[PDB]
């Protein structure tokens, strides 16, 4: 329902001379743009990545970002000379800029900066601001960055006006891809538990899109409260993988079922019963020597 658009900048500074800035752009869980240090121009990872903008509008926006990339690099290179030797190389900067789109003609725009892995500076209103609990030696660099009224004025515009206008048109351009439904495929496996006489029943469910899914170990109408929902692991084909774990006492496996509910199925949930002939037939297709197991 609510889509967050984020531009992620990864700037690595090894020493006084060596540096590289690489960026990626997302609209929900789908990558829209790619820009490597070795690349002069921004690359599209979707046919609708330009949105509703013109080849002129996009090129003007591009050049702006092209001078920003060379400028930023020297700008923080000079901020390390300012703080020197309070902060020394290697340095890692991370920028997360963008906007979240809410129902109605309304949105919230953000610009968060993390230094050496920790979030320290944000752009808020008309200026750069240090977040609470940020180191005091960041005050002078932020005072110097706030002295630059041209960058401040363009960043104000880029967040307030450009981000909502670009994304409103980005969602319309990529409606078919975002609303695409990919049916999940589930399989069962078992591993030994950390506890003696126990077994860890694993329900692998892969290739589902969109991300929201429901996976549970059942015993009839009883949701097994010991079922552990894993993290969402991505697939290379822009789909998702998730596995639900259940620690059972060896011998209690019979009766259990992995039930998975997804938007793509249309009410027809996948009910995967343990001791079933489909599982017996499946289990035999994936046998091995168990060498180098966990």
């Amino acid at each position, epitope marked *: 329902k609510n889509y967050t658009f984020r531009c992620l900048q990864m700037s690595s500074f090894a020493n006084r001379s060596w540096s590289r800035t690489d960026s990626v752009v997302w609209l929900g869980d789908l990558q829209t743009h790619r820009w490597s240090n070795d690349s002069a121009t921004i690359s599209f990872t979707k046919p609708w990545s330009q949105g509703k903008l013109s080849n002129q509008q996009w090129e003007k926006l591009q050049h702006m970002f092209q*001078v920003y990339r*060379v*400028s930023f690099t*020297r*700008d923080i290179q*000079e*901020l390390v*000379k*300012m703080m*020197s030797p309070k902060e020394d190389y290697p340095i890692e900067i991370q920028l997360s800029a963008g906007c979240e789109m809410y129902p109605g003609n309304a949105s919230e725009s953000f610009l968060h900066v993390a230094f050496q892995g920790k979030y320290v500076v944000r752009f808020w209103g008309t200026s750069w601001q240090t977040v609470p609990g940020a180191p005091s030696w960041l005050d*002078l660099p932020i*005072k*110097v*960055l*706030n*002295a*630059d*009224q*041209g*960058t401040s004025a363009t960043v104000q515009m880029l967040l307030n006006d450009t981000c909502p206008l670009f994304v409103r048109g980005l969602l319309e351009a990529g409606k078919s891809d975002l609303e695409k439904q990919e049916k999940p495929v589930a399989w069962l496996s078992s591993v030994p538990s950390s506890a003696h006489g126990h077994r860890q029943l694993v329900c692998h469910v892969s290739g589902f899109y969109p991300k929201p899914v429901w996976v549970m170990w059942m015993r009839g109408d009883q949701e097994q409260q010991g079922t552990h929902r894993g993290d969402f692991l991505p697939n290379a084909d822009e789909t998702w993988y998730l596995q639900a774990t259940l620690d059972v006492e060896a011998g209690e496996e019979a009766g259990l079922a992995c039930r998975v509910k997804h938007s793509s199925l249309g009410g027809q949930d996948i009910i995967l019963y343990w001791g079933s002939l489909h599982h017996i037939l499946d289990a035999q297709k994936m046998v091995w020597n168990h060498r180098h197991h966990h």
Partner: T-cell receptor
Framework: EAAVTQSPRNKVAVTGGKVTLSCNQT?????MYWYRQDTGHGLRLIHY???????EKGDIPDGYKASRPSQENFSLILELATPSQTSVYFC??????????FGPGTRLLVLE | TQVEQSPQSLVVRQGENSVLQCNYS??????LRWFKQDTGKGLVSLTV?????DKTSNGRYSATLDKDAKHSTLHITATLLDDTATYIC?????????????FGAGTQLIVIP
């Protein structure tokens, strides 16, 4: 209202002798700059500082050393003077802003 | 050369107008400053232009800026004999202390009585 003073106004040196061009500012400006003006060029940046203790290399730093002992003073040291260093040297200072406030200059002649 | 000033030298009759040109390739270009430098003297600022299409005035000194054509022009109307000096064009690449200044070679103005 934002002044920068330099010493000396004129200097003569021997090729291989130490020369120290001094600059002073009482504006409480954090950043200070050392330039040299030559016929056919614009002012070229030799060294610069971001505060007391800091000394960063400029576009043309070979043959020059720099020293910022405090907020007020910034020096340009020529441990081994050469006739190519015969120039007129300008000093500047500034705060977080873009404006640089220039000094009256220093004529340096390096003779054999 | 990132900042070029034309002509190298200009001669004007006392009371006539003088036009000095500045053309640059500095990227980015935050502002353009015009300095007056008397022989053996320091750099005195005359005017600063900051917008894409800017126009400024300091009484007798007027200047333009076209950041698209990356060109500025300085107008000295009704030149006095005391205007005999070098006029230098500077381009700053940031709106703060982080920026570098890119100085022109100057144009020598000679006011003849």
């Amino acid at each position: 209202e934002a002044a920068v003073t330099q010493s000396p106004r004129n200097k003569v040196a021997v090729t291989g002798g130490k020369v120290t061009l001094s600059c002073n500012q009482t504006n409480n400006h954090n950043n200070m700059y050392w330039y040299r003006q030559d016929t056919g060029h614009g002012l070229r940046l030799i060294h610069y500082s971001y505060g007391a203790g800091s000394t960063e290399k400029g576009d043309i730093p070979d043959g020059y050393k720099a020293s910022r002992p405090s907020q007020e003073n910034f020096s340009l040291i020529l441990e081994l003077a050469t006739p190519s260093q015969t120039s007129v040297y300008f000093c500047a200072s500034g705060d977080e802003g873009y404006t640089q406030y220039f000094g009256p200059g220093t004529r340096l002649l390096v003779l054999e | 050369t990132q900042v070029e000033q034309s002509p190298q030298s200009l001669v004007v009759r006392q009371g006539e107008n003088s036009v000095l040109q500045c053309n640059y390739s500095v990227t980015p270009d935050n502002h353009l400053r015009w300095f007056k430098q008397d022989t053996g003297k320091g750099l005195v600022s005359l005017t600063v232009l900051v917008d894409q299409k800017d126009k400024t005035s300091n009484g007798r000194y007027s200047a333009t800026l076209d950041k698209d054509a990356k060109h500025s022009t300085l107008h000295i109307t009704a030149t006095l004999l005391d205007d005999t000096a070098t006029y230098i064009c500077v381009v700053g690449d940031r709106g703060s202390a982080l920026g570098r200044l890119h100085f022109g070679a100057g144009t020598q103005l000679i006011v003849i009585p």
